Design a protein around this ligand. Structure first.
Ligand SMILES: OC[C@H]1O[C@@H](O[C@H]2[C@H](O)[C@@H](O)[C@H](O)O[C@@H]2CO)[C@H](O)[C@@H](O)[C@@H]1O
Ligand SMILES: OC[C@H]1O[C@@H](O[C@H]2[C@H](O)[C@@H](O)[C@H](O)O[C@@H]2CO)[C@H](O)[C@@H](O)[C@@H]1O
Ligand SMILES: [Mg+2]
Ligand SMILES: [Mg+2]
Lengths: 732, 733
């Protein structure tokens, strides 16, 4: 037995059931748990962990209370450090668009450095749910629609948070979320029903969670949705059979917020006692906020409705997490010394602006650039118009953790910084983020999140048209506010808000060159924009340095290299659209009536998976395979030469897709199986070599057999999912 | 069994070429020119025909059989979906009757007319559950509810097949599309279907089982994948489930070109392997692509299939023909060789009274401000819109042998009703679409949409002049039938933009505005519900549609139709359906917070819920009473309520019973329909309604597909729609 198992067995042999049950309780200071009452419960050994306490003096005060409990078992402290702690990086969907594991790893490592510097031990991150439904407000928190890329980045984020040793003072534990399938909510409505086949679940939706487990994630946060009728919180197949027995996870499972009590609303339980029994016997170790475990576990055990082994499993997992975090060696390892001077948590000197700026550059996606309008010269008169141009609150995104809006660089400020006095900027708000007062009241319902200009729409439009007439070109900064792409904010319309589209149509009618800088947390419907704007830059929500990174691209300090990781539908009525779909019996070419299509809109996404432009031109040589036949246990090489055939240095992403065109299940028309992000000076050439073996060729059949079948495979290489060249080989 | 001995004696005579010929189902067309097809019938190489539909044409094919060695008769099939020559409303409108006897009458008359023309079989009923309004084939089903669709599935089969499948006024039902076709992802026709086995078993499979249990002679296999496996190659679906579990003894028929489509699905790399997959999965009869005739001999000689695969398939064809009476008399539906010739389309061979009476029952009153409807037969009525004079649209999609020139338009029904007592003024107003690419689609293959060559603005000014000269406006608007048909999936559920511009302009005249909606799917009607004075959903109401619509508008019939599919506020809410799960964070009138399962940019819930529809009278329900608070296994419970007509006009409504199982081993729906009663009442009349419930109503498939009723609370809800109910509880012991 390891030091950890010996230590835990010796501690648990000493504990009462009250102490073991106390370890399972995860709470936050708030209405339900006032601070002084919570401190008294920590002193009594009734608390296992805290979330949403995020400064060193507040965390140290809580850890000080444990010295009063009989066994002095330390707390751990968690937070939602999703894409940054104090220095906010782009939202995950924009990080994914970097196609660069090292950039994504740097965002996670800095997030862990900052969170651990504030005394935190754990982040409820990474979010690795696959998203094919643009309506869902939580698409901003994932890495897009692709199983290969999301799985790769899931393991990258875990390793970057946890480091070489979970006891390092600058490591935090990753609690991968949301296990499982949360992003397949029916209708894109948050928390809604998820219903899907086991082959789809295993092939497409579960691999990112398994990648996090295999990267050593210490914790798993359980989702709020049903899976095929069974809430994840009560799902013994998911949490025990799959996560523990099949995948071998040895860490901690954490319920979502009030999730145990929500089993009553889901109709699995008629009271809190039965909800508690279902959750702990399914495999939920730690109970977030609703305190059902502390209220009901003793009565359940005395009635023989649960086993002692249910409590022991759950407690062992909490203690094992604390052991790996170093907290039994030193409960203050992330909290410095008792004789440390006080400091300003929010000091500018504790931020990481260089890293945020460098990361944010990599995720920006050039969607359109007519006749080389971009990059802009630093000269002339530039009108900067729209409700997002001066928005600090929106550039940091949803789930901005301890980010301070006043510390963020707006798009306006970024342009001002870039041009100094070489160009003149003219500002007009142009429109409110929405013209619908019910939507503004929603967005401002808890906090003041959206500045509502008191002027009429007409007055703002006249001011913006005067500003555009006084300029050489217009940079319109438009899209969503961050509260439009957040938990529970599902959208029925994927367009830019109507108030802003009215502004864009008015700006277009001036005849001035029109550059759109889009801020948004989900794919948008951009048909009018693709037809009418001169250039389009997707910037997602780019974080604390967003405005500087966006100016870096617009003025060509950085040659855009971002590529989409989620298909952009032409309208909400096409949902879902995603690149790794099945052919059907009647596929549409581009073209007949009797094919799988809509009749009232053009078909396919407006922008496909892997799409994104450059200020330079790239060429690919013909694809070459090392052989036409592949033996089992051997490796196939796919080679292409990439050249920079243009006039500016830049990067692109060479993507490899596979198709299995004859199989015992209908397989996708293509599936991403590799990529290379390659930065080239003008006239440079690189031989790209992909390696494929049997593991790349397997799939789950109807009975969940996971093998590769002999026969043809098609290999596609290109700079997006739509513009590829292909060669075939045969697996023997 | 005389039948199994007759069939075994015949099959003992047949070569494999003869047995394989029985499996071939073809139509006259480019791929099968008439003279080549006739030569193949004489050679024993054809088992059945589809799309040949008149007595002289069918007799001519059956006459060719006399030249083959064994003289095995053909059967003849057609798509008699909602009528043969007399067209009833589309199925989604028949469902809105909530009256199994109305649905049975439409099917009986369809079978009478089709068998009168020599047909033996219809590819009907379509019983696919539909929760996605974008799909163009929702017009062909009975809406979103498993209980109602399952009930109507069995009614349709019994009505087609009668007491005896050999009767000359019977046809065989080929229930379709097995299975799950209406769950196409994105609402895109033919697209991927992916769902859990508990959802499949509880909600989507029961209508097909109801058809099998009602004695359907045939099952038509679907075009989609189910969890990755095309239905056409799905041995689990076609053999394990349909034959071994459900005990189906009849004929399986591939869809059109479906065996060859296994190559596009990526299950086969060539036609030989596609053929092997389909016959071994359990597809008996091969529609149109001739892969069975081309490849089965080679497959069998290579040992890639078994003789038993050919024998199973041939036996099922011969057994269908036996049941249809065709071995006793191949001409039993074709009269005598010297019957005089007749006009297939004669007016005396129609059933207009039945079509008019059935079409009245499906019409749904959605809005009626301050008693505008019913109208008086007087004054000046402007009849405006591209569907007002459309014969082609009123008969719907899948209109079989219906003749548009025999149909009654909405304009003609109003003209019939008012005679000389009122003045009608007509203006087209708008084309069905202002988008030339959409008109190009709707006129592709066949010119089905009349395009007025004037500008949109000229058509609008003419309609405004007409409206200004009238006392009120009847706007006849919505979809053309080609917008809600196979492959016509929509991304927008609104009335078309050209017509919404027309409605906004008409509203601005101040004239009372009555909307008569034609459509084959739920529509997004938020502006209409706010601005029209009255709204009548007429679906596509068939050959007598215009007369049934006038009957309602002038109050000869009190509208009694109720929705069987939820109407979303917009396409971005799809899917919306009444029997959804609660979730952990429900949004409803009792749960109105930010952190719930909702959209933020639109009102939540459907605009019109399942079971919604208004009347020209008012109804009252007494309090719901249960016969006991406890139910023992093996016993039945009664739920009683009294329905009263508390208004001034006779009319019907539909009392609906829903069940909830609020604590279960799976999350169960907030409500599930478990009974209904359509009741016609005079003013001041009352009817005591007694619903019976037992354990069978309470069971569900759990995660292991155990069919279980668990002890505990059940809530019983009664009301006149799914949103306006009250509940009482009982406990199952
Ligand atoms: O709902 C707002 C509320 O959510 C709380 O739970 C979060 C949980 O912390 C997070 O990791 C997960 O991704 O989402 C759930 C909500 O679905 C959160 O702790 C609160 O701070 C927040 O106010
Ligand atoms: O695609 C139009 C074409 O469909 C043919 O097959 C029909 C089949 O007859 C019907 O029962 C089923 O519901 O739909 C398939 C098409 O999906 C039909 O036989 C042809 O008449 C028709 O032109
Ligand atoms: Mg293969
Ligand atoms: Mg129950």
């Amino acid at each position: 037995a390891t030091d950890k198992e010996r230590f835990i067995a010796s501690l648990m042999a000493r504990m009462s059931n009250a102490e073991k049950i106390g370890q399972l309780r995860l709470v936050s200071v708030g209405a339900d748990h006032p601070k002084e009452a919570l401190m008294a419960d920590i002193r009594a050994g009734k608390v296992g962990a805290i979330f949403n306490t995020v400064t060193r003096p507040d965390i140290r005060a809580m850890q000080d209370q444990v010295r009063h409990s009989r066994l002095k078992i330390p707390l751990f402290h968690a937070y939602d450090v999703a894409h940054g702690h104090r220095t906010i990086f782009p939202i995950s969907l924009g990080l994914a668009a970097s196609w660069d594991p090292e950039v994504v790893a740097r965002s996670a490592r800095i997030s862990a450095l900052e969170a651990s510097a504030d005394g935190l031990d754990m982040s409820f991150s990474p979010m690795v749910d696959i998203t094919r439904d643009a309506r869902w407000g939580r698409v901003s928190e994932g890495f897009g629609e692709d199983t290969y890329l999301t799985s790769l980045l899931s393991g990258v984020m875990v390793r970057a948070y946890q480091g070489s040793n979970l006891a390092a003072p600058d490591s935090i534990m990753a609690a991968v979320k949301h296990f499982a399938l949360y992003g397949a909510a029916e209708g894109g409505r948050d928390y809604n029903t998820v219903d899907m086949s086991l082959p789809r679940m295993f092939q497409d939706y579960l691999p990112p969670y398994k990648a996090a487990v295999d990267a050593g994630a210490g914790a798993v946060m359980v989702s709020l949705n049903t899976i095929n009728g069974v809430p994840a919180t009560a799902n013994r197949w998911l949490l025990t059979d799959l996560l523990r027995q099949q995948w071998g996870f040895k860490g901690l499972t954490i319920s979502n917020h009030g999730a145990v009590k929500e089993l009553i609303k889901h109709g699995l339980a008629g009271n809190e006692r039965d909800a508690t029994r279902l959750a702990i016997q399914a495999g939920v170790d730690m109970n977030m906020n609703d305190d059902l475990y502390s209220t009901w576990l003793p009565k359940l055990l005395a009635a023989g409705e649960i086993d002692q082994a249910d409590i022991d499993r759950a407690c062992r997992d909490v203690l094992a997490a604390k052991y790996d975090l170093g907290l039994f060696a030193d409960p203050y390892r992330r909290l410095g010394k008792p004789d440390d001077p006080p400091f300003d948590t929010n000091a500018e000197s504790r931020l990481h602006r260089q890293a945020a700026r460098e990361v944010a550059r990599e995720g920006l996606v050039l969607l359109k650039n007519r006749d080389g309008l971009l990059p802009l010269k630093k000269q002339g008169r530039i009108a900067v118009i729209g409700p997002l141009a001066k928005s600090q609150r929106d550039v940091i995104g949803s789930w901005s953790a301890a980010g301070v809006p006043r510390q963020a660089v707006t798009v306006y400020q970024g342009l001002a910084n870039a041009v100094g006095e070489r160009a003149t900027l003219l500002y007009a708000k142009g429109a409110n983020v929405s013209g619908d007062q019910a939507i503004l009241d929603y967005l401002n319902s808890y906090n003041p999140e959206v500045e509502v200009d008191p002027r009429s729409a007409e007055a703002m439009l006249e001011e913006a048209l005067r500003t555009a007439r006084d300029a050489d070109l217009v940079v319109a900064v438009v899209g969503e506010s961050q509260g439009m792409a957040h938990e529970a904010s599902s959208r029925t319309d994927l367009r830019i808000p109507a108030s802003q589209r009215r502004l864009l149509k008015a700006l277009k009618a001036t005849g001035k060159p029109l550059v759109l800088v889009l801020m948004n947390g989900r794919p948008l419907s951009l048909g009018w924009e693709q037809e009418n704007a001169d250039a389009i830059l997707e910037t997602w929500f780019s974080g604390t340095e967003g405005g500087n990174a966006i100016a870096d691209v617009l003025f060509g300090e950085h040659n855009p290299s971002g590529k989409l990781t989620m298909s952009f539908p032409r309208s909400v009525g096409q949902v879902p659209v995603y690149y790794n779909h099945l052919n059907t019996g009647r596929p549409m070419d581009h073209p007949g009536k009797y094919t799988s299509r809509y009749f009232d809109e053009a078909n396919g996404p407006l922008y496909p998976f892997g799409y994104g432009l450059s200020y330079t031109e790239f060429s690919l040589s013909p694809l070459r395979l090392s052989s036409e036949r592949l033996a089992r246990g051997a490796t196939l090489e796919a080679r292409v030469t990439l050249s920079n055939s243009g006039k500016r240095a830049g990067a692109t992403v060479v993507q490899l897709y596979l198709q299995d065109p004859v199989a015992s299940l209908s397989r996708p028309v293509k599936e991403l199986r590799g990529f290379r992000k390659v930065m080239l000076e003008p006239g440079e050439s690189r031989e790209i070599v992909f390696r494929l073996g049997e593991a790349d060729l397997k799939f789950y059949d109807s009975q969940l057999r996971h093998t590769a079948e002999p026969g043809e495979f098609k290999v596609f290489v290109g700079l997006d999912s739509a513009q590829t060249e292909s060669r075939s080989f045969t697996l023997l």
